[model samples]
Every structure is written in C-alpha cells, then in structure tokens.
Target: EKPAACRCSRQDPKNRVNCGFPGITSDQCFTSGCCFDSQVPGVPWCFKPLPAQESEECVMQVSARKNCGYPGISPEDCAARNCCFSDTIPEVPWCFFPMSVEDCHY
Candidate 1:
C-alpha cells in the first residue's frame, strides 16, 4: 500500500499533477494549483499525481497481470477486478482536487 503522505506531499501551490499509464512524466506537471480555483461550480479541477510508493516495474507487472484476467473490459471493470493493483485509493491514475476543511460545509 502506498503511503498517503507520499502522495499528498507532491502537491504545490502551482502545478496540477498528472499520473497516467506510464506514470509520472515531467510534462504532466501544470502551472496550476491542485484542483481548479474557478468560480464555476463544476468546472474541471486539476490534481497532483501521487508518487508510486511501489516500484514502477512492480506496479505495472501487477496491473498487467490483473488486467489479463479479463480479455476486454472497460476501466470500471478493471477497477472492480483489481482495485488492489493501483493505490489503495480507488480513484488513482487520475488527478485529485483538494477541498479545504471549511469547504466541507454542512
């Protein structure tokens, strides 16, 4: 399991992280804060890529093996079948927008 601290620590005031198929890439970094600061309610929010605590090769190997089980399936299927292959967090490989504590208004 990857440590939450490692993942969240990559965040910065500027730069929305991207964690795609090949893992973290230099170009993936954007000059925007984690999550969108737009006034629009549902506008797209950027997220920082969490570092792969596990070895890249290992993570890929495990992900590939698990994916092989289903001949052809959608992302939802993969998530359902091998959620463990990715980070313990379900919505991995995608950017994560942060919410301030106060934002979680009642």
Candidate 2:
C-alpha cells in the first residue's frame, strides 16, 4: 500500500470513492488497507487507495521496435494491454513497454 499521505492525496477529495463501511474506525480503516479522513464532510471517511500514474519514460527512451503488440495495433489497443504508445516518432513501433517492474526489470 502507498503511504497514508500519498494514498489519501492521490485521489481528489471530491472523487474519493468509499472503501470502508460507515462504521469503520480510523484503525479499522488502516487494517482494511484504506485511507481515513473525516475532516472532509462531503466525501467518504474511508476511501480507496488510488494507484499511481503511468510512467512514460520507457517509451520516452527509444528502442529497436520493442514490439509490445502486433503490427497495426491502434492506440486504444496498445493502452488496453497497458503498453506505452507515442506516434510522434514514425517508423518505430508505437506500442512498447512501460517502465513496469515485471516488463522492464529496471
């Protein structure tokens, strides 16, 4: 889990969806692996941990057609598989790996 400060702030206050039940106490919220904040009146006291944004550095670094997907894959197709896409540089495969631990081993 991301730290409490990070997880709580990652989600916009208005958009935080419910993670724990209404009766969830601060300690119980932590045990449930969710963030707790009653300071905001309009939103959930216990909410989900929003995931981190995708890193573009992998595609940002050029490779010899890393070829994440088959030829002719659309942007949506590339992203659907969590692949990175950028057509700014032509002739190179637009779909390539992200800087993910499993795929990158970086």
Candidate 3:
C-alpha cells in the first residue's frame, strides 16, 4: 500500500495546477503532487504498479515449468487467476502469483 503522505498529495493546489511538477513523473503523482487537475478525484492514483502477493498455489500455476510456453494470458486473465504482473523488475516480465491473503507488510 502507498504511504498516507504520498497518497494525498494529488490534491495539492500547486501540483494540480502544475501537472507534472519539476521532478515528478506520472507514477510519482500520488506522493509528489504531479498529476493533472482532472486526475485529482482519482487521487490515490493507479499510476504505480501494485506489489505481488505470496501464494503457493499461484506460484505453482505461473511456474515456468507450468505456463512458460503458454500464450494468450492477458492482464485481465492474470487478475482473474488471482495474480499480478510484477513491476519491480522491468527487464524480466512475469506475473506475481496471488495468495489467499496479502501480507500486511507488503
């Protein structure tokens, strides 16, 4: 989850008016006051990707040994399968398997 401080800056008047302030990127909008006024309502922006959940079942399902060569799994499919694509490493593309419950610290 996003820190509360970072999550509320989207409503900052300066940020709303500046839209992409000096050093802020779209992904930093939530915490850095850098999004357009139009995007303020949807505050806790989805610009940044979510973290992966831990699950034995989901791990097994997306395992290279299982679905490696398989194709046609869309982002929607991953969500339906209760998994998420990892955003931590841009060089390696893979889904983060889902768990029945998310760890609080994650």
Candidate 4:
C-alpha cells in the first residue's frame, strides 16, 4: 500500500479525482486514508489527494530495467499509483520505479 499525503489545502478542487468506489462513504474514504470533500460536484466525495510529482525518473533511459507491476498495466494506472511510466520502446519495462534521490551517494 502507498502512503497518502492527505493534505487538503493544496491541490485544486476542480482537479480532484476519485480514488474509490461509486458508493464510497466518508468513513470508507477515511479508512483508506484519503480525502473527503463533498462540496465539489461531479466528482467523487471520496478521492485521493493529488499525487506528488516525480517527473525526474519517468524517462525511457536504457538503465530503466525494473518493472513496476504485472504485465499489461495501463499507463494511466501506473500514474495513479505514482510511479514512472513510458511506453516508447519494446522489450523493456514500460512502468518502473524512479531512481530515488535519497539512494544517491553524491
């Protein structure tokens, strides 16, 4: 499972996206550690806080050899899960982990 930011004041309300089921309740949403905002219309009241951006390691660099999930995972799902995804080439991982800045020895 991923850790959520759950910060409500930052991400724009209009950009809010549903991260749960159609009938998701505030309790259920809270149980998942996501945000609950019912003031917005046409969006799920229970939704994930906007994900942090990690665009640095989203490239198709040759060293991106690790796979992020099972075969056939869509690029959209990969993004929702907050990992890097690129489908430009074949015989390599389209979804993979970012090279963590903390992992660097520099």
Error of 4 at 88 (Å): 0.9
Per-residue lDDT tens digits for candidate 3, residues 1-106, read 2333222332232222343344444445544433222344433333332222342233222232222212344565655664555433333334554433423221
Q: How far is candidate 4 from the true structure (C-alpha RMSD, Å)?
A: 12.0
Is 2 or 4 the stronger prediction by lDDT? Answer: 2
Q: Write the per-residue lDDT of candidate 2 for residues 1-106, one digit (tens) a residue.
A: 3234444543445655788888776767766777666667778877765432343344233453376775587878777875777665677767776544333210
C-alpha lDDT of residue 33 in model 4: 65
Reference-based lDDT, residue 97, model 4: 75
Considering every candidate listed, which one attains the maximal lDDT?
A: 2
| TM-score for all models, in order of appearance | 0.19, 0.42, 0.24, 0.37
Report RMSD (Å) for each prediction in the order shown: 15.0, 11.2, 12.6, 12.0
Name the better of 1 and 3 by lDDT. 3
In model 2, what are the clashing residue pairs, if there are any? none
Deviating ranges (above 4 Å) for candidate 1: 1-3, 8-72, 84-106
| Candidate 2 total steric clashes | 0
Instruction: State, as a TM-score between 0 and 1, how close model 1 is to the true structure.
Output: 0.19
Candidate 1 has its poorest 10 consecutive residues by lDDT at 97-106
Off by over 4 Å in 4: 1-55, 102-106
What does candidate 4's lDDT look like per residue over 24-65, in tens digits?
Answer: 666676577675665566866666654423443443343443
Stretches of model 2 off by over 4 angstroms after superposition? 53-106
Candidate 1, residue 42: how far the Cα is off, in Å: 42
Give the best candidate by TM-score. Answer: 2
